[PDB]
């Protein structure tokens, strides 16, 4: 036995209270509008003209205020998010900057100059929705359970997906069709990205770059960098007999070419390179800060560049000849990008564009001037910045020419289908890889990710791993500095690289220091180094988000401090024992000694993906050994948000787990606390949501019991008459009539109307009365006297909602009344009339439709088991067992072995035991309750111990031989009903370009018949049916052709030969004649040859 | 979205439909149930004999 | 078919002469053997077997 502490499960709520699930999306923005907004400001602060050096601009300070709206004139009032969501406005706040401009002779400092607007998060620090109370949240018409984190642009909710990319400032060694190849990608703080690569062929190294035309030997670059003696080159490369035999060809090639001085080397580089100032100067500037930008040069010293290139050559030498390669699927190097850095680049580009634009408008007005004073405030606009930001957020196409980058599909509409789909959208992460079938590694589950990305959470279909979600315990590191770090490193006793020579780095005891892809220097006794660094990090002087690891194969220590890394808190162990004791958790239960105090007392610590590579972690406390360094807090944290709704995930299979994770966001339910006030395009509601009996701790962590999307129902696993096919499940008519599974659909209909540049306006006719009675016409029946429909009425098919009359050019108006399109008859809930930001009238209407479950609906069991309805079974059937309880939904026992789902039976058992006892049972992953203490509790009441009951059939009236599995199960209703997935078309609209049915079921179109089914018709041998339903019912046209000269005539008359004798008619589909008449513009004349079919 | 493999090869036809299938072991092997709403939309032309 | 989320479609022939070509060649009673092997593909379902 070992002392166990069953109290570390309360550390996770305390850690989630400060940050975690969705708060990091807001911290990425709050740190951005407080640091990076000032960073770009101090980047571009002074701009000067070119006409005369007397005019100049300066910036004092910049900041962003509170969300405000500019109404009719000189009226700034605080706006609410729901107000913008209902008026289709945009949630933005102005940016107040302090500018200084020198006009005439004196200097002017105009404070509080507005230059534009900028969107604000829903739960940011500058917004109103922060630090409030639920009573005050209800006064603003906003759900308090809304996690937020999205953008409101033109009355839609847009979320920016986190995107993963490869790390910069690093050396990669890959393998291709020829052999091994090394590469280095560099990107500094300024706008210049480079990608150099060293290739090996027939034992000769070559360097390739984007600006270089042909390959140049590495020894030439060495001699050009500044090292003259060839001995020092090999000395820097490596002091070994086998690395010198592989460097012989390069040495003899450098000796063959007449290159022995630095000037000759630079001349050769200038002759080789092509750029579209002599050759020596351009060759020197090309090697200074062009190929490698992440390595700064003080004046002209290439010593550090030489050392880096020597380490790269040694790496590519040690790689070649062995079976060691570096892979890109490793997540220790892959970095994440939030919405902060994208906004940073966008704002920097927009600010530079705005500074360069006004510089160009005020340069040709000073020479050709008519006054003595020139004010820059009058020649200023604040519309470009706002328009650019709004368009970049709405469209989602990040196009930056200064960075030379184009990205599409970054922002997506926030799915408001359910409460889980809305939160799960914030945790979605997309990859930069395209839809490639060939790639399988990155899609496959990687051993690197452990507790950072949920394995089960992934979409089923084409994207089988490209889309991933975060875990419960996950934190993204922000940006920091490196001054104190390098200072402490130099104080520890790290030697400078400029002191030692090339032969020392080859020594095994010698170790190199790497910091964000930069060689810090040489150090001995790296173990004491790492120990002291970790002690200083645990102390509190250095920030906690600093990663340090060691590599013995490469013999170097890596120090990672850049922003965008993955880390999760781990409990520290002290040589046989966790530092966390019971007295430390009793204080946390009391209310003191929070996560911050625990991190300040050296109790827990964050570790990176590469940092945990050099340590031993124990799962439980009984597994803790003498080599373990860190301890897992909770093992059920590995599962994701959508995976926390599955009872007993370890009992279920991974395909079923993935299916249930995919279907959890598809189930309909309650959206929030204000669902009747919000007016979205499509919304689904349930009637009476029940509470899950066997809930999970993750359910309580997110408070899913307050907005459930399912219902509990009695299930009996047994076969029925004829409708228990593999997924077909039957329903109970009496329960359906009582109201089990009643759903509601809500559709939005919005109509905007504005003015024009002339005096032409719009108007609404309204009701139309006849001469017989004083009642409205059948067309405008729901129309009221004003001109809009009244709420609380019923609209049938082909009914006018609102009368819209638009001027054609006193002016003649054309009537375009919007008509409701639907199969069933909807109902009117409410009508909202408001004004937009462009002084335009906007009328919104919400149409409700209550539906009931019928044959053809899709239901799920929250266990990866989806099924369509069978037959509706009445109440005379559904035999009772002993008391008179009828099965609500009969389940088929033939699909259980195929799916291999054992968690369903345990779920049913635990639910029955709970509903009998009267307390909810926990079913969390890697724990919960067993089947031994629950089986003995089901006996006290009087039922059978596991699942069996005596059932007497109701159809015949005799007892059943075998026993039936009865119990309550949590079911959920999904979308894709039979009423919407049902359409037919016989004769409707067609296209004008080609006479064929239109695409889509909303435009009354038909179905497509491709070659997939045409090959099946050909294999049979039927040709009349193939031409009947590809030519007769698709497109049939009569065309006249001449036999002498094949051409298209008209009314049996040719215009080329001028003869009426030679003429005939044929049946040709419109597509063929279309192609024949379209190919004539390519200087091609299709001449047909008519032959006698009879003879 | 061309004209060789977009219009000629595709050539989508009318007088058709699509709906979710349901089990019904009460018919023969060559039988199928058609909903009334769909049967009312579809039409078959025939010439009148004696 | 999987009978869980499948969407199956249906066509109606327009020409009377082609109505006879789909009855003799594309017949359910006729097409019971598969061309590749020669075994009957329509035997039963797991429920009927049990």
């Amino acid at each position: 036995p070992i002392p166990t502490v069953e109290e570390k499960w309360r550390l996770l709520p305390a850690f989630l209270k400060v940050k975690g699930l969705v708060k990091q999306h807001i911290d990425s923005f709050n740190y951005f509008i407080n640091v990076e907004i000032k960073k770009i400001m101090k980047a571009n602060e002074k701009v000067t003209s070119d006409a005369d050096p007397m005019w100049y601009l300066k910036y004092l300070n910049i900041y962003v205020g509170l969300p405000d709206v500019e109404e009719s004139f000189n009226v700034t009032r605080p706006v609410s998010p729901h107000e913008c969501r209902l008026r289709d406005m945009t949630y933005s706040a102005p940016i107040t900057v302090d500018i200084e401009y020198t006009r005439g002779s004196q200097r002017i400092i105009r404070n509080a100059l507005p230059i534009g607007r900028m969107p604000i998060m829903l739960r940011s620090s500058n917004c109103v929705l922060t630090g409030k109370t639920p009573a005050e949240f209800a006064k603003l018409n906003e759900c308090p359970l809304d996690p937020g984190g999205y953008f409101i642009v033109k009355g839609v909710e847009k979320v920016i997906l986190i995107q993963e990319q490869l790390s910069k400032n690093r050396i990669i060694v890959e393998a291709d069709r020829k052999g091994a190849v090394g590469a280095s990608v560099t990107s500094s703080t300024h706008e210049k990205k480079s990608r150099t690569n060293m290739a090996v062929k027939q034992g000769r190294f070559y360097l390739r770059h984007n600006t270089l035309s042909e390959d140049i030997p590495i020894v030439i670059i060495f001699k050009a960098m500044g090292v003259e003696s060839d001995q020092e080159i090999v000395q820097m490369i490596g002091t070994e007999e086998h690395v010198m035999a592989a460097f012989g060809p390069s040495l003899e090639e450098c000796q063959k070419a007449q290159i022995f001085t630095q000037m000759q080397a630079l001349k050769y580089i200038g002759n080789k390179v092509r750029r579209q100032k002599t050759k020596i100067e351009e060759a020197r500037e090309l090697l200074a800060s062009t190929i490698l930008t992440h390595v700064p040069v003080k004046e002209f010293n290439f010593r550090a560049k030489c050392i880096y290139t020597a380490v790269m050559v040694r790496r590519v030498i040690l790689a070649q000849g062995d079976n060691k390669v570096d892979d890109r699927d490793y997540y220790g190097n892959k970095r994440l990008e939030l919405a902060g850095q994208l906004l940073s680049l966008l704002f920097e580009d927009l600010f530079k564009k705005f500074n360069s634009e006004m510089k160009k408008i005020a340069d040709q007005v000073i020479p050709k001037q008519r006054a003595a004073q020139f004010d820059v405030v009058k020649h200023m606009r604040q519309d470009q910045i706002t328009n650019g930001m709004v368009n970049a957020i709405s469209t989602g196409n990040w196009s930056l020419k200064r960075f030379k980058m184009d990205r599409q599909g970054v922002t997506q509409v926030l799915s408001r289908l359910s409460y889980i789909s809305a939160l799960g959208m914030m945790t979605r992460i997309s990859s930069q890889f395209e839809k490639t079938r060939k790639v399988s590694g990155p899609r496959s589950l990687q051993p690197s990710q452990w507790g950072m990305l949920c394995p089960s959470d992934t979409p089923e279909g084409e994207a089988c791993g490209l889309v991933k979600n975060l875990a419960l315990m996950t934190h993204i590191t922000t940006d920091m500095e490196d001054g104190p770090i390098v200072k402490l490193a130099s104080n520890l006793g790290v030697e400078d690289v400029n002191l030692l020579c090339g032969e020392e780095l080859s020594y095994p005891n010698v170790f190199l220091v790497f910091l964000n892809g930069n060689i810090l220097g040489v150090i001995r006794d790296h173990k004491k180094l790492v120990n002291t660094f970790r002690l200083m990090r645990r102390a509190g002087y250095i920030n906690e988000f600093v990663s340090i690891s060691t590599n013995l194969t490469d013999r170097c220590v890596y120090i990672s401090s850049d922003g965008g890394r993955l880390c999760r808190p781990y409990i520290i162990v002290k040589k046989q024992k966790p530092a966390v004791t019971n007295k430390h958790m009793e204080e946390l239960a009391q209310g003191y000694r929070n996560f911050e105090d625990f991190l300040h007392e050296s109790l827990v610590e964050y570790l990176d993906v590469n940092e945990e590579n050099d340590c031993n972690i124990a799962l439980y406390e009984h597994t803790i050994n003498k080599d373990t360094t860190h301890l897992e807090i909770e093992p059920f944290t590995l599962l994701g948000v959508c995976a926390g709704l599955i009872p007993y995930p370890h009992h279920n299979q991974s395909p079923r787990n993935t299916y249930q994770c995919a279907m959890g966001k598809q189930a309909m339910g309650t959206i929030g606390y204000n669902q009747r006030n919000r007016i979205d395009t499509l919304m689904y509601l349930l009637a009476y949501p029940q509470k899950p009996m066997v809930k999970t701790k993750t359910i309580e962590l997110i408070e899913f019991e307050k907005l459930p999307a399912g219902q509990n129902a009695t299930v009996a696993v047994m076969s029925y008459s004829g409708y228990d096919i593999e997924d077909a499940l039957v329903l109970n008519k009496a329960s359906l009539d009582r109201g089990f599974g009643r759903c509601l659909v809500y559709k939005n209909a919005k109509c905007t109307l504005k003015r024009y540049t002339n005096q032409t306006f719009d108007k609404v006719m309204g009701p139309m009365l006849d001469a017989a009675t004083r009642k409205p016409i059948w067309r405008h029946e729901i129309l009221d006297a004003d001109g809009i429909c009244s709420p609380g009425e019923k609209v049938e098919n082909k009914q006018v909602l609102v009368n819209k009359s638009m001027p054609t050019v006193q002016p003649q108006y054309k009537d375009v009344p919007i008509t409701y399109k639907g199969a069933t008859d909807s109902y009117i809930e409410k009508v909202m009339i408001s004004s937009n930001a462009e002084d335009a009238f906007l009328i919104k209407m919400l149409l409700r439709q209550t539906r009931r479950p019928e044959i053809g609906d899709k239901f799920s069991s929250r266990h990866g088991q989806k099924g369509v309805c069978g037959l509706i079974v009445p109440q005379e059937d559904m035999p009772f067992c002993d008391s008179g309880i009828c099965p609500d939904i009969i389940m088929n026992p033939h699909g259980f072995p195929s799916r291999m789902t054992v968690g369903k039976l345990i779920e049913l058992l635990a639910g029955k035991a709970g509903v009998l006892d009267g307390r909810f049972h926990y079913g969390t992953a890697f724990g919960g309750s067993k089947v031994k203490d629950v089986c003995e509790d089901l006996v006290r009441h009087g039922y059978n111990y596991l699942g069996k009951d005596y059932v007497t059939s109701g159809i015949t009236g005799e007892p059943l031989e075998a026993y039936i599995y009865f119990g309550p199960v949590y079911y959920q209703k999904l979308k894709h009903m039979v009423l919407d997935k049902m359409h037919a078309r016989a004769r409707g609209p067609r296209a004008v370009l080609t006479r064929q049915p239109t695409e889509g079921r909303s435009r009354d179109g038909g179905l497509r018949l491709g070659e997939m089914e045409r090959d099946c018709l050909i294999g049979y041998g039927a040709s009349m049916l193939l031409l009947e339903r590809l030519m007769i019912s698709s497109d049939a046209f009569e065309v006249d052709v001449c036999g002498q000269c094949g051409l298209l005539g008209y009314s049996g008359w040719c215009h080329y030969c001028k003869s009426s004798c030679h003429v005939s008619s044929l049946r040709i589909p419109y597509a063929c004649k279309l192609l024949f008449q379209e190919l004539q513009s390519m200087n091609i004349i299709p001449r047909l040859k008519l032959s006698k079919y009879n003879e | 979205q061309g004209r060789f493999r977009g219009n000629l090869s595709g050539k989508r036809v009318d007088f058709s439909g699509r709906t979710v299938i349901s089990p019904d072991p009460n018919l023969r092997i060559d039988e199928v149930a058609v909903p009334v709403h769909v049967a009312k939309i579809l039409t078959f032309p025939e010439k009148v004999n004696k | 078919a999987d009978f869980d989320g499948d969407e199956m479609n249906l066509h109606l022939p327009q020409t009377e002469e082609a109505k006879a070509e789909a009855l003799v060649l594309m017949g359910t009673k006729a097409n019971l053997v598969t061309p590749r092997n020669g075994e009957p593909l329509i035997a039963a379902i797991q429920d009927f077997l049990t």
Binding site: V413, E462, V992, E1011 | - | -
Partner: peptide, 30 residues
């Protein structure tokens, strides 16, 4: 015979289109 790739040379047909249903919610005619 040149070393080409089937994917880039042969353009995607109806054969390639894998008909599969996923939740993806949220021209002149005469």
């Amino acid at each position: 015979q040149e070393e080409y790739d089937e994917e880039e040379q042969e353009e995607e047909n109806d054969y390639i289109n894998s008909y599969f249903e996923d939740g993806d919610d949220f021209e002149a005619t005469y």
